[PDB]
């Protein structure tokens, strides 16, 4: 279950929507600032309830 499988099953629109959502959420990013927590990014990616 990945982007290729999603494209083959549903179509070209689903991975495009997922990547646009990821890019829109990831706009909170800067190098010379303090550490940050990516709450919305983890919620969208689905890994907000598991530990890596």
């Amino acid at each position: 279950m990945n982007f290729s499988t999603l494209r083959n099953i549903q179509g070209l629109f689903a991975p495009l929507k997922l990547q646009m959502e990821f890019k829109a959420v990831q706009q909170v990013q800067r190098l010379p600032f303090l550490s940050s927590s990516n709450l919305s990014l983890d919620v969208l990616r689905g890994n907000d309830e598991t530990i890596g």
């Binding site: 982007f3 290729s4 494209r7 070209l12 991975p15 495009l16 990547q19």
Partner: protein
């Protein structure tokens, strides 16, 4: 070692050549030289406006060296499969080859495949 690399040398079309591959989490570094030095430096990245994001098109940019269409064509046809098989990751290529031809490219692709680290 945080970074994994492989190297191997042969003789391609009668001239010795050295191939080195090093893998990062954001780039793959491929060195193909016939002079022992890094010559033209080329960067290949997936397009950010690709409609097919599973198999996106590649954009070629020359960072250091001479800018010619042949360089772009050679780099794309040489490392497209390396970019594709690594999970759509960017490739940083340093190539210094005396003469460019399709037979030489096909011969070098096998040597690149042998040194797979991705």
């Amino acid at each position: 070692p945080l970074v994994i690399s492989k190297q191997k040398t042969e003789v391609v079309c009668g001239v010795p050549t050295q191939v080195v591959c090093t893998a990062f989490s954001s780039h793959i570094l491929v060195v193909v030289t016939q002079f022992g030095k890094m010559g033209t430096l080329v960067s290949l990245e997936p397009s950010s406006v690709a409609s097919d994001v599973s198999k996106p098109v590649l954009t070629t940019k020359v960072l250091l060296g001479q800018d010619e269409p042949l360089i772009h064509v050679f780099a794309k046809n040489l490392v497209a499969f390396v970019s594709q098989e690594a999970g759509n990751r960017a490739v940083l290529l340093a190539v210094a080859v005396k003469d460019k031809s399709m037979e030489g490219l096909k011969a070098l692709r096998e040597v690149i495949r042998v040194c797979q680290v991705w």
